[PDB]
Design a protein around this nucleic acid. Structure first.
Ligand code: NA
Length: 290
DNA sequence: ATCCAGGTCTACC
DNA sequence: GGTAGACCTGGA
């Protein structure tokens, strides 16, 4: 694990001896949409019906608004703290072409997020800009999510399946999902009536999981890979969006290679570490606007 | 303006 | 199996 012990305080939990953990790298690498950077460098986020604030001071991480029981059963896995990222980076760095990207995002960790929230979040992500994606997700939450209080402000949890099933296509359009509104409505319908079961899909091996996710309207090869990587821990995923495409064309493939060929090339080369390789590549490419 | 952003769906050889 | 057009929105 990438930490050694924790200390439960009155208003938070302190995680000691943390390694491969930097706030900007984790929250701004593209994998999540409900974490917001604070003036002081901290980040406040909403996940699993809770508001959490995270601060990094030296080798210690302070997670506000949670206790030890919550750290053990929810947040330790949320931050993927049981995985040794030093080994991941060591293996990937054997490839000189990946070195610069790994060095740039040394503190990245792949969060273990909720399948339902992630499914809808990435359907919204298609042919969209992150700022807009964040707004749409928060609007959806404000419209039907549970009220949460933290430091004088009311935050809204992501809606339950039952509450989201109450949405009409127009409701999604109002939250500004654009043309994706119909996809979100259809998807929530299939989750609600049980046509597709997320717990079942998450239990499948990487390839079968990917195929089932593509059954959802609005989900293609890229969105499916994001969903299984970010909420189902299927690490052979290699989501090829515009940024990863650019990164791969700069290092491994020609400018006329299809996205499918790029995905297959990446998965073949990086294997079980494809998802991690993709994140370092994405973050470097987007931040440096290659 | 025309293109781009965490693409996907539809029509079609 | 592989491939041009259309598609909400809004900052550059
Ligand atoms: Na689909």
């Amino acid at each position: 694990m990438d930490f050694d012990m924790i200390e439960e305080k009155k208003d938070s939990v302190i995680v000691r001896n943390v390694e491969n953990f930097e706030l900007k790298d984790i929250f701004d690498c593209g994998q999540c949409f409900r974490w917001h950077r604070q003036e002081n460098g901290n980040y406040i986020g909403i996940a699993f019906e809770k508001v959490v604030e995270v601060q990094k001071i030296g080798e210690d991480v302070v997670i506000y608004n949670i206790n030890e029981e919550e750290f053990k059963n929810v947040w330790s896995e949320y931050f993927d703290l049981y995985r040794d990222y030093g080994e991941i980076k060591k293996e990937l760095s054997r490839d000189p072409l990946l070195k610069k990207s790994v060095d740039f995002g040394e503190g990245i960790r792949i969060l273990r997020q909720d399948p339902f929230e992630i499914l809808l979040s990435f359907i919204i992500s298609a042919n969209n800009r992150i700022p807009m994606i964040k707004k749409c997700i928060n609007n959806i939450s404000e419209k039907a999510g549970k009220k949460l209080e933290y430091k004088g402000k009311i935050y809204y949890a992501f809606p339950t399946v039952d509450k989201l099933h109450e949405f009409t296509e127009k409701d999604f359009e109002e939250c500004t999902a654009g043309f994706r509104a119909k996809y979100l409505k259809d998807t929530v319908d299939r989750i609600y009536n049980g046509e597709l079961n997320l717990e079942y899909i998450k239990s499948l091996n990487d390839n079968e999981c990917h195929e089932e996710l593509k059954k959802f309207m609005g989900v293609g090869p890229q969105v499916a890979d994001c969903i299984m990587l970010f909420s189902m821990q299927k690490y052979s995923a290699f989501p090829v969006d515009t940024w990863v495409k650019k990164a791969m064309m700069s290092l491994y493939v020609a400018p006329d290679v299809s996205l499918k060929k790029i995905r297959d090339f990446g998965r073949e080369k990086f294997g079980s570490l494809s998802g991690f390789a993709q994140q370092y590549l994405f973050y470097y490419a987007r931040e440096n606007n290659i």
